[PDB]
């Protein structure tokens, strides 16, 4: 019958979706319902002919587009991406009224995206009442973190009553990539130490000991850790308090600066795109050079820092938009980690992403370096497929 | 004639002082003029019989105490501890009107302590007009940091116009300890990679490549990096912004919490003193255990992170109150760094601080581990003595 999985990702102003074959996890259809909540909303199926509304309206359009393509009868599972699962979700679950209630409980931890996810769930339940639906969380993989790894240095009341703690993100990616690495590197999952560098527009490092996440660079919010596209990353709180006095800016004013105006875009004053910055550096632009150098320095710093949660380091894995495609960043990051005895294979590192799961380190390297393309829709689908066998 | 150096440290509410022999750098007198700016002020010479006023009043008392001890005629040099030298000071200098003017320029970077230092300089110039006086800066050693190491991910204007950047502290300690390490470990200064862990009430890590500071854990303020006695250390700015909404606290309200109420005291809810917390952990107290475990985790994390600024790691050096005396912390931190191939010599690590400069790592260790007691007054004096030969 060739059943399919409908993967849904509801952002603050967009609904991204994919349709994957159950047997192969091949993408059969992809799209994005952009410009949400605004009066102008457009659906772009397969990147062609935009056609012109609330969250349910956009999904009803997608459902009617699958109905006219005769795929509605093949949708056996629906996968939902949830931004934040708090401490309540440690893995992917079958959606029920209880799960919805519990997602709503943790929604204050991400008031923007989580309510959009619930809107996507409410709509998909209305349109597909007979289809099994699953929730896959960004945070769930990092719930194996020890208290010493997730606690902040703040007073205990902030953690006990307010729930302030490290959660970490890109967890679905970090899990997927780690699983693939045991195959590629011929490692035993239960006797392994990996560092996964997820480098995209948002970026995080994760240390994976014996199949479990033990440290990750993002905190309670996606703002901590690595410097990113428009995100500052680690920043001295005293420096932020010093700025507030000099500029007369509040905490909310500076939160927007840290999130939207900082990072690669902030230092260079040009772009959050590395392709632009690399060219500018070769064209002699110094602020683009510094932005990249700082980006690399902070990546090296966190990769090495995260390695302290491992007993033995077996592999460093690059993934995400930047991790998969930037030959320069990988070279610089690896060369910034000679202290861990890394040796780069320059020609292998030059190979484009089309070569997929690949080794980029030379033989004398003490630690294997690799690129593994991340596929978050596939992991969502694979979780959905596995949960498809359940009788509940 | 046996000339001496008068070392002065002016805090926000105290004047600490020592008198060191020029030839040996042996402490001949030590004291503290505490309770400054308040109406009750007491001078404690050698920890006996407190005797009972502005910054000049307290120093005039010290000067009269040296006059009655017949040492005033032996004071050939006066050393001043300056909290912050901005970007203007890269080393210890002979104090002139120009230097004073320039210290005043950078005093907005530390409005509390720096003006107290200038008050100590103004007073010491009044009391000892014929004595050479030198300034030694907490920040100066970290001025060798590359832009990639000291820049934050914030927009460029914050660095260019406001001067927001990493400065780092304990620089005098980090320099001194690093110099001693080349002797103890038989290393060539110009071909070496050290990590210095300064663990006291305030704590910082510093990476020293070829004699130069290349990375350090504190930032623009002493609030960034390691979790400390009452300091939180690295904290997600988004988490702080999240708290502000829930509690209704401002940025200044949270700065005091981060600085005075957090850290070891914050998590344990008991003490900032490790001796208390160690006993409590053995007595079964869980929050004291977690405070120490988090303290160690964050130390391990930064030591390993800082090692990425080195090409070869030769030694890890412990110093400061905790680094010198805490057998437990050293054991746990080293055992948390098996990834760097560290091997602890348990019996050597048990040796008390009276054994001074000592190796605590076993032979199979890939990296030498050592304790080197820090002496900031001596480094101030040694800088003063060297600058004593100058004709200006």
Swiss-Prot record, chains A, B:
Q: Give GO terms for biological process.
A: acetate metabolic process; L-threonine catabolic process to propionate
Entry keyword annotation includes Magnesium: yes
* Residues that hold substrate according to the record: 81
List GO terms (cellular component aspect): cytosol
Q: Report the catalytic activity.
A: propanoate + ATP = propanoyl phosphate + ADP
Q: Give the positions of the site Transition state stabilizer.
A: 170, 231
PROSITE patterns documented for this protein: ACETATE_KINASE_1, ACETATE_KINASE_2
The active site annotation covers 138 (proton donor/acceptor)
Annotated ATP binding lies at 9, 16, 170, 198-202, 273-275, 321-325
Pathway stated in the Swiss-Prot or TrEMBL entry: Amino-acid degradation; L-threonine degradation via propanoate pathway; propanoate from L-threonine: step 4/4
Under Gene3D superfamilies, the record lists: 3.30.420.40
UniProt binding sites for Mg(2+): 9, 376
Coiled-coil residues are none
Entry keyword set: ATP-binding, Kinase, Magnesium, Metal-binding, Nucleotide-binding, Transferase
Q: Which of the seven top EC classes does this enzyme belong to?
A: transferase
Its Enzyme Commission number(s) read 2.7.2.15
Any one GO MF annotation of this record: acetate kinase activity
**Cofactor(s) needed by this chain:** Mg(2+)
The similarity comment for this entry is:
Belongs to the acetokinase family. TdcD subfamily.
Query: Quaternary form?
Result: Homodimer.
Main function = Catalyzes the conversion of propionyl phosphate and ADP to propionate and ATP. It can also use acetyl phosphate as phosphate group acceptor.
Please state what the protein is called: Propionate kinase
Q: Which organism is it from?
A: Salmonella typhimurium (strain LT2 / SGSC1412 / ATCC 700720)
